[PDB]
Amino acid sequence: HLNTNPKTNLRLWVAFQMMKGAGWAGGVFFGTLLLIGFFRVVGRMLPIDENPAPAPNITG
Amino acid sequence: NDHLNTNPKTNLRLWVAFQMMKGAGWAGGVFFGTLLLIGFFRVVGRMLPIDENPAPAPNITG
Amino acid sequence: MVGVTAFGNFDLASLAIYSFWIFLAGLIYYLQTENMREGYPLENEDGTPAANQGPFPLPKPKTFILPHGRGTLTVPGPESEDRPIALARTAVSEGFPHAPTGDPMKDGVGPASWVARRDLPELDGHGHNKIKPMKAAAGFYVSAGKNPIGLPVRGCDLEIAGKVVDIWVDIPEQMARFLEVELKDGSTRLLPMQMVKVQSNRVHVNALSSDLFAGIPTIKSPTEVTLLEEDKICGYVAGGLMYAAPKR
Amino acid sequence: AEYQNIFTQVQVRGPADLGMTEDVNLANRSGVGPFSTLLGWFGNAQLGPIYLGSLGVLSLFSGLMWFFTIGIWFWYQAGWNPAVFLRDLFFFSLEPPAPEYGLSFAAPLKEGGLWLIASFFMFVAVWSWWGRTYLRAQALGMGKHTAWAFLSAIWLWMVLGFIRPILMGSWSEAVPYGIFSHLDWTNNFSLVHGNLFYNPFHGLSIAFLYGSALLFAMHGATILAVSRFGGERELEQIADRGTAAERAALFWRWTMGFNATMEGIHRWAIWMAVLVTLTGGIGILLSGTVVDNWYVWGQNHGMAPL
Amino acid sequence: MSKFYKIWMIFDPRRVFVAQGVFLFLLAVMIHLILLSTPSYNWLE
Amino acid sequence: MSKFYKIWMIFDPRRVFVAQGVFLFLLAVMIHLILLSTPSYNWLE
Amino acid sequence: MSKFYKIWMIFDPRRVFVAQGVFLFLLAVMIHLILLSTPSYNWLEISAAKYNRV
Amino acid sequence: MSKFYKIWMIFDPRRVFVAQGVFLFLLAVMIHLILLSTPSYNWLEISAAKYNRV
Amino acid sequence: MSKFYKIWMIFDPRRVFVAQGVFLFLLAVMIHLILLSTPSYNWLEISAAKYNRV
Amino acid sequence: ALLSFERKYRVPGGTLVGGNLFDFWVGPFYVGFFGVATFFFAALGIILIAWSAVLQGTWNPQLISVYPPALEYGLGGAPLAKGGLWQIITICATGAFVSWALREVEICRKLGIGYHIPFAFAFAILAYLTLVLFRPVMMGAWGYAFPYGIWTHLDWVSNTGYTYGNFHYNPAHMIAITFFFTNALALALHGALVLSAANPEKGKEMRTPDHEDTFFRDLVGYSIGTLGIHRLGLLLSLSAVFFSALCMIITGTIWFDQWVDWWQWWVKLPWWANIPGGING
Amino acid sequence: DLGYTGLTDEQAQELHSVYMSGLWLFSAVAIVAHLAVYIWRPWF
Amino acid sequence: LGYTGLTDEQAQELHSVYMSGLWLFSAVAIVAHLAVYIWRPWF
Amino acid sequence: SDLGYTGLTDEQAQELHSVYMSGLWLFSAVAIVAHLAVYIWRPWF
Amino acid sequence: VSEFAFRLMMAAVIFVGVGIMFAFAGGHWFVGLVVGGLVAAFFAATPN
Ligand code: BCL
Ligand SMILES: CC[C@H]1c2cc3[nH]c4c(c3C)C(=O)[C@H](C(=O)OC)c4c3nc(cc4[nH]c(cc(n2)[C@@H]1C)c(C(C)=O)c4C)[C@@H](C)[C@@H]3CCC(=O)OC/C=C(\C)CCC[C@H](C)CCC[C@H](C)CCCC(C)C
Ligand SMILES: COC(C)(C)C/C=C/C(C)=C/C=C/C(C)=C/C=C/C(C)=C/C=C/C=C(C)/C=C/C=C(\C)CC/C=C(\C)CCC=C(C)C
Ligand SMILES: COC(C)(C)C/C=C/C(C)=C/C=C/C(C)=C/C=C/C(C)=C/C=C/C=C(C)/C=C/C=C(\C)CC/C=C(\C)CCC=C(C)C
Ligand SMILES: COC(C)(C)C/C=C/C(C)=C/C=C/C(C)=C/C=C/C(C)=C/C=C/C=C(C)/C=C/C=C(\C)CC/C=C(\C)CCC=C(C)C
Ligand SMILES: COC(C)(C)C/C=C/C(C)=C/C=C/C(C)=C/C=C/C(C)=C/C=C/C=C(C)/C=C/C=C(\C)CC/C=C(\C)CCC=C(C)C
Ligand SMILES: COC(C)(C)C/C=C/C(C)=C/C=C/C(C)=C/C=C/C(C)=C/C=C/C=C(C)/C=C/C=C(\C)CC/C=C(\C)CCC=C(C)C
Ligand SMILES: COC(C)(C)C/C=C/C(C)=C/C=C/C(C)=C/C=C/C(C)=C/C=C\C=C(C)\C=C\C=C(/C)CC/C=C(\C)CCC=C(C)C
Ligand SMILES: CCCCCCCCCCCCO[C@@H]1O[C@H](CO)[C@@H](O[C@H]2O[C@H](CO)[C@@H](O)[C@H](O)[C@H]2O)[C@H](O)[C@H]1O
Ligand SMILES: CCCCCCCCCCCCO[C@@H]1O[C@H](CO)[C@@H](O[C@H]2O[C@H](CO)[C@@H](O)[C@H](O)[C@H]2O)[C@H](O)[C@H]1O
Ligand SMILES: [Fe+3]
């Protein structure tokens, strides 16, 4: 009910929209990174690395 | 965006974020000014014959 | 070398250092008590004496004899702010600001506060008015620096409020104390020189806006100014830094 | 900008003030000298009159003899060469006699006797000047505070040049009359007595010197901050307390928790200043006569690891 | 740069700001990872 | 607990938000400097 | 303890709240730094040596 | 014993409460520090020794 | 002896009470410190000797 | 409790940060935003000094010391036991001093007075930073700073002063010392003069600024005036601190040898450099 | 009630809801960064 | 009673909310302490 | 003013002292419990 | 910027310049420093 002047609110609105876009993109990227980390965690927890599978592909 | 907007909830969120941004930006400005000042003193020390005439330790390590 | 110790490692140097600790404690006690001759005893925010008065007792009274029969001032003694202080406490508990009830710049509270000093002029060692306008003084002239007479006076809102007419100077000090300023209505207000920025083409005043110079207190005489008037003028002028702020 | 009242922006000049006269003997008084605009940008531009009584003229004559004696010896060290005299002026020295003479006056003039003569001159000059300050306070009916404040520095001076050499039994201990000679005397005094930093009275003297600087920064800043309320007129604020005195008191009341008055801050000031030389004289007196190694003494009294 | 304001006669800003924020953040992440990939700047060793 | 909103009935939010902003930035700078000083975490090599 | 709310009949909440906040954060930093000073509880060095990062 | 409430006829309870709080906290800190300075009671290294966390 | 109460007719109770309280605390701390400095009365070191904690 | 004249000044306003959140007085103290900050920093610094005492193994107040990191750490971090506690306490001390200055700024605004006091305090703060920030960084090591002990910081002073011979030959040091000594002399004179005027011989009338002008003109043929003496005191103290920070900003950064050799440039002036006779001829 | 700040109950409720929404968002962002860093280089 | 200008109902509500915060804070601290003690017990 | 320099009454003082004694005893009991726990853990006698 | 302030900055810069010039020309830095200080002081003391 007190707020600020409309001119600063315009900068605030623009920055809020940009931050919402960046925030969703960051949420997607960090969800993927956390999923990769979860698979890394379960892989380290597993008896893997006592059985290193050979390279399926030539170096290339 | 300026004449229609969406809701006063957006204005309240923007105002709260603006206030916290003011605080964090004053903190950032003072911190970065300190960093600039120390960088200036260090770079002035770089171009001086110090490190060619080093001085011994003025106090024991402790 | 008398390096002999009476006991333990207590030599003459130890005697000296402990003697100085004792003397310093006594001296700090004396200095603190000599500085409790104003504003004591402490009072509650309602004006009654407070429960706590500090570990230091009040000193014995001392009497000053003012040079020109102005009377004997004994300090410490009874004290009272003999003026209508217009403030209301914002909180029931102690230690909170007292809000002004009215216009603080006019009531003389906060940064605009003034003290009910004696309503008599300031007398030099010759028994004459210490401060008098340039005309009243005989032979005094602007010896150096800018001469701020006839210059426009620009308030903090950047609008002219008047023109400088005369300077009030100090007789035994030869210091320029006050500027006399005339407004649109032809009346004169005094300005302390510590608040004016005397430029080359104007005499700026950051303390007061243009529509406040008429609110400056006036003087009963146009040649003599008393301590009460000086205090009122200075308090009003310095109060504009906080209160005349919203108008740039 | 906002004016800070560090320089007067407008100067005013009037009749020459010849001062007051409570019991002053007008005969010895001088006449007003010139007026200094440059120096008037900072304070009173008037110079003179100067009172020249009987202790005053005694002090002037003795100080003239002391300074002139040092000057003649400096010329002698120069080979009477003006170019050398202006080249080695700082490095000159009217040194005291070497320790083998002890306290004896039987020292050759070139070997410290001239130092004895100049020291007599300066002793007489300074003591007559102290009497002068006391008498000038007496004539105007004022308190003798300046006389005692001077006596503090006089005691440090007497310890450095007179009392400590007598106690040590040789004039060789005293300070030479040279620019870098007395600097070297200071550094060598510290080195001989083993880190004068661990002299407790040297530490106290430094505490009160730092305190004098702190206290005068505080007081000058305070009075300039309330000069807009006529804070400069400290005597009238004592007699008739104004808003300047109350605002100055309340600033420090709200900052530190305690405050002074317009009169008692000057009690603080004078004591903070005189304790410098009082503790310094005590510390120099104890050095050598009582303690010859201050760091070992410190070790024995806390103050330093064993 | 004067006339570039007419760009908001073409595209609705309420969506353009979101799209641009996404773009710039993803560009930042790409550059960060590219510096990570080279061995002379990988700050996460 | 569901009465924590009353903290705003005592403190003016206009100032508490600025206070929190400066506090959080200082605390973040603090922990970053603590980590950078650690040999095992000094990511700026 | 049932009548400890009377502590608010002595102290205005505004000053007590800021005093308590300063006190608590001071104590928290105090204890964290105490632990970070001793070699037994410096978690940074514990994790460095456990994972052989030196 | 049963008439010590009269102490609040002499001292303002606000002053005394603040003074006592400061004094109690400082005393507790100084006793904790006294204990933590002596190797016999420094619980951090006591635990480090009892668990071979050195 | 049985007319010692009249001391309160000549001394303000508040200042005397605070002065005697601070005096008592300072004396108590000084005596505890003198004892703690002396090895024969440092109860911490005595307890360590009894239980061979070093 | 308040002084007999305090109440008319205890009004809201003048606060830089907040405005009513931290606008109150605890006892005589004005607590602001910066009051809270300075209390926190000071309490942390004191507690950490005591903690470093127990880590050092001493409870002698005159033996407690908190040393900075060694020269090997350069301008980097350090473990708390080695030099980290000193770095944290330097952070706390800098924060406390700055918060104190800004709290003084708030008090000045609330009382409607000039800002001379916080400015003069900023001078001391910058001298402190010259000793703990500017000189170490220009030198490249936090071990060039001083420890936080009563007598060990004098050890720092002595070792630094003898790293360059007799420090008395630093000329910025000379002007700073002259300023300090004349400032002490000025303070003695000012206190004595005001006390002599306010306290007459015995049972007679108080004196006037003209009377003290008269006394000092009859003494030394001059008087600077009551505004001039306070100007002079502030200037002497601030310039003493300035040339102190100057003598320790050029030392070990511009001049590296014994400072006495500086004074050789004057005695080797070619016109009289090679004249026989005198001290150096 | 107390009204030290001139805020009605509903205004305080609305502002507090906005503040706690932002608080939870910030806390979640920090938690995600903390887990990512812990996986990359744990401190335990 | 007397100073602070508060009522018993206002004081009761204020203490109730303050105790809610107190117990929430204390519980979070307790869970943190137990986790640390599991990680590196000090007794 | 032995009837109360602080302006309290003998009724308010009674209640204040009762609540303060309650708090002091609660604090002291907590301290006793902590003292005994440490004394079991490592007695100082 | 007051007349005195402009005169002060000009005095500083002219002092630096003439000091450099007379240090190279005069055979030593002392001569240049003395000449620069003298001229700059005589310039700054005189008003406009
Ligand atoms: C390496 C050298 C030693 C050291 C060796 C000494 C020695 C030796 C002495 C001091 C003394 C002092 N030291 Mg030390 N000091 C050291 C390091 C320091 C440091 C520092 C940061 O390191 C500081 C701040 C100080 C500070 C001080 C002062 C507090 C004190 C001087 C008081 C004074 O103002 O006398 C100045 C005033 C006078 C000497 C009296 C002058 C007044 C009389 C009346 C003169 C008359 C004037 C005459 C009539 C006319 C004048 C001539 C005209 C003007 C031309 N020292 C180191 C450790 N120091 C002095 C002292 O007393 O301390 C115990 C002293 O003797
Ligand atoms: C509290 C300790 C501090 C202190 C205090 C202090 N000093 C004091 C006083 C006080 C309270 C005085 O009252 C006294 C004084 O008069 O001050 C102006 C003084 C004084 N402190 C002085 C100096 C001084 N104080 C110093 C230090 C200190 N003084 C401490 C820091 C130092 C240092 C640091 O070394 C010095 C150099 C003097 C200015 C003065 C004492 C003057 C005095 O005794 O003079 C005697 C004269 C001589 C021995 C030589 C005179 C040389 C002349 C060239 C003679 C010829 C004159 C000529 C003929 C004049 C012609 C005039 C006509 C043309 C009109
Ligand atoms: C493998 O091959 C390699 C890479 C080795 C080499 C081969 C490279 C090849 C094949 C390169 C091909 C390059 C080409 C074809 C590049 C073309 C580049 C062009 C056309 C770039 C154009 C840039 C134009 C810009 C950025 C224009 C911006 C214009 C505006 C922003 C206009 C503003 C409009 C507004 C404001 C609204 C308009 C509305 C009104 C009402 C005015
Ligand atoms: C070097 O020497 C060492 C340190 C080793 C040994 C020396 C040790 C020494 C000298 C120790 C001294 C210890 C002393 C004297 C300790 C005294 C401690 C006391 C008295 C602690 C008291 C604590 C009291 C508390 C925690 C009470 C809290 C009460 C409340 C929270 C209730 C609030 C009361 C209200 C609200 C009153 C209601 C009022 C109305 C109007 C309804
Ligand atoms: C380095 O040198 C050494 C220390 C080795 C040797 C030197 C020793 C020296 C110089 C020793 C000097 C000793 C001296 C001078 C001792 C003097 C002792 C005196 C005069 C003691 C007097 C004591 C008086 C006492 C304890 C009185 C106590 C009174 C009361 C407890 C009653 C309180 C008064 C009341 C209640 C009056 C109130 C009644 C009404 C109606 C107001
Ligand atoms: C020295 O000590 C060390 C570091 C060694 C260890 C000790 C560490 C300690 C004790 C650290 C203490 C940490 C504490 C107590 C941290 C406290 C953090 C808190 C309470 C943070 C609260 C944050 C609340 C936030 C960020 C709320 C933000 C809300 C808004 C910005 C509302 C507007 C925004 C909305 C609604 C959505 C987003 C939209 C925009 C435009 C941002
Ligand atoms: C070196 O020595 C060491 C540190 C090792 C050992 C020393 C240890 C010592 C001495 C430790 C001391 C510990 C103490 C005394 C800890 C005390 C902790 C306390 C009392 C914590 C209190 C926490 C309280 C909290 C978190 C309060 C939350 C309160 C609220 C959220 C208030 C709610 C009120 C609102 C929202 C507005 C109310 C308004 C209306 C109208 C109802
Ligand atoms: C062109 O030049 C002419 C010839 C015209 C004049 C120039 C003269 C010059 C250049 C003079 C230079 C003077 C200087 C540089 C003097 C330096 C003096 C310094 C630095 C003194 C420092 C300390 C001096 C002290 C502490 C002296 C203390 C003396 C006493 C306390 C009195 C001593 C009294 C004694 C020894 C006993 C006296 C009693 C009898 C019976 C002899
Ligand atoms: C501080 C103001 C009040 C001063 C105290 C009032 C009495 C004034 C005279 C007291 C002088 C005696 O004071 C006492 O001197 C002896 C002399 O060995 C000191 O001696 C003690 O400590 C020193 C230094 O660690 C040890 O080397 C020595 O073995 C030990 O006896 C005491 O630490 C001191 O407390
Ligand atoms: C800011 C005012 C002062 C400015 C000082 C600036 C730093 C120095 C600037 C001048 C530097 C060069 O100035 C010049 O250097 C040469 C160096 O050989 C010196 O000159 C000296 O050697 C040269 C040959 O080289 C001879 O011709 C000359 O007779 C001799 O005096 C002098 O020092 C000066 O004539
Ligand atoms: Fe003064």
Author numbering:
A (entry chain x): 10 to 69
B (entry chain X): 8 to 69
C (entry chain H): 1 to 248
D (entry chain M): 1 to 306
E (entry chain a), F (entry chain A): 1 to 45
G (entry chain D), H (entry chain F), I (entry chain I): 1 to 54
J (entry chain L): 1 to 281
K (entry chain B): 5 to 48
Give the authors' words.
Rhodobacter sphaeroides is a model organism in bacterial photosynthesis, and its light-harvesting-reaction center (LH1–RC) complex contains both dimeric and monomeric forms. The core light-harvesting (LH1) system of Rba. sphaeroides is characterized by the coexistence of dimeric and monomeric forms corresponding to the S- and C-shaped structures, respectively, observed in native membranes. In addition to PufX, a previously unrecognized integral membrane protein, referred to as protein-U, was identified in the core complex. Protein-U is located opposite PufX on the LH1-ring opening and has a U-shaped conformation.
The cryo-EM structure of the dimeric LH1–RC complex from native Rba. sphaeroides IL106 was determined at 2.75 Å resolution with C1 symmetry. The two halves in the LH1–RC dimer, designated as monomer A and monomer B, are not symmetric. Monomer A is rotated approximately 8˚ anticlockwise relative to the mirror image of monomer B, as determined from the dihedral angle of cross sections in the two monomers that are perpendicular to the presumed membrane surface. This rotation results in a significantly larger opening in the LH1 ring of monomer A than the LH1 ring of monomer B. The two monomers in the dimeric LH1–RC are arranged in a bent configuration with an angle of approximately 150° inclined toward each other of their presumed periplasmic surfaces. The Rba. sphaeroides LH1 dimeric complex is composed of 28 pairs of αβ-polypeptides, 56 bacteriochlorophylls (BChl) a, and 52 spheroidenes surrounding two RCs with an S-shaped structure. While two PufX polypeptides and all LH1 and RC polypeptides were fully identified in the dimer, protein-U in monomer B was only partially detected, presumably due to its large disorder. The protein-U in monomer B could only be traced from fragmented densities for 13 amino acids near the cytoplasmic side, while other portions were highly disordered. Superposition of the RC M-subunits between the two monomers showed that the 13–14th αβ-polypeptides in monomer B have gradually shifted inward from their corresponding pairs in monomer A at the end of the LH1 rings, reaching a maximum deviation of approximately 6 Å for the last 14th αβ-pair (chain ID: 07/08). The junction of the two monomers is composed of two PufX and two pairs of LH1 αβ-polypeptides. The two PufX polypeptides function as linkers connecting the two monomers, and due to a largely tilted conformation, the two PufX polypeptides can only interact with each other through their N-terminal domains on the cytoplasmic side of the membrane.
